[PDB]
Design an enzyme around this catalytic site. Sequence first.
Site: not given
Ligand SMILES: CC(C)c1cccc2c(-c3ccc(CS(C)(=O)=O)c(Cl)c3)c(C(=O)O)[nH]c12
Ligand code: NA
Ligand code: NA
Ligand SMILES: [Zn+2]
Ligand SMILES: [Zn+2]
Length: 233
Positions: A85, A87, A89, A150, A181
């Site tokens: 996707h 984002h 990451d 997501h 997120n």
């Molecule tokens: C937009 C992108 C670059 C990004 C930026 C910063 C954080 C995320 C997260 C993410 C993933 C896991 C947790 C821990 S949890 C499941 O909430 O226990 C948290 Cl806090 C946040 C994700 C994601 O969810 O894919 N993406 C992120």
């Molecule tokens: Na999202």
């Molecule tokens: Na992003």
């Molecule tokens: Zn994402």
């Molecule tokens: Zn992610």
Amino acid sequence: SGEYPTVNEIPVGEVRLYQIADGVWSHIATQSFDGAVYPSNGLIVRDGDELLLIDTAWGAKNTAALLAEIEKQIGLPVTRAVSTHFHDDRVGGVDVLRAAGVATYASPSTRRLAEAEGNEIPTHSLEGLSSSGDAVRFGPVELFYPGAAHSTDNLVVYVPSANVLYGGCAVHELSSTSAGNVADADLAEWPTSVERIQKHYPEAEVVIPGHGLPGGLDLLQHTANVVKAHKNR
Ligand SMILES: CC(C)c1cccc2c(-c3ccc(CS(C)(=O)=O)c(Cl)c3)c(C(=O)O)[nH]c12
Ligand code: NA
Ligand code: NA
Ligand SMILES: [Zn+2]
Ligand SMILES: [Zn+2]
């Protein structure tokens, strides 16, 4: 320990590989975002004497370190990459890959969203994935569009030779208490999209989330549960 590496074990800028199955590895890196540090996963799948990469290592430097770690540990060239996707990451590092000669791919929806976000843009469009339930072959994997979860564009990846299901960020790890997120998520549709994954890949043996520890098929139901907890309250 040989256990799966966690966020506090990987300095930002280093990359670890973890063998999942014969010819299948995950890659793990960490990155800072809005003042907190997060781990994230991608996948590497052997493609004869070449490698297919799924997702960047969340940033240009991390992705350069990923290529170096692959050369050290595996010693085969990465020739193609798919981002699951839009984002950072998933696509942050695509410019590094492209300059290194890797052909980079994503769905048209991902490419549009990445462009609009100001993120790096994979070069080639993956057709045949625009409707929920669509599947296409790409080297040694199948790409599947489960529906919005997501993100509206999220893809999942299955490695048939090993029964490995890479859920990407549509799938959360078992220890998760929140839905990550959710800024670009569709919390109402997410459980239906997970149900599609469950129906399509009933023989999956390993399920890999976009962030955190792999496990079994339980990750799918757990994801639906945590998404409902978030949506409900
Ligand atoms: C937009 C992108 C670059 C990004 C930026 C910063 C954080 C995320 C997260 C993410 C993933 C896991 C947790 C821990 S949890 C499941 O909430 O226990 C948290 Cl806090 C946040 C994700 C994601 O969810 O894919 N993406 C992120
Ligand atoms: Na999202
Ligand atoms: Na992003
Ligand atoms: Zn994402
Ligand atoms: Zn992610």
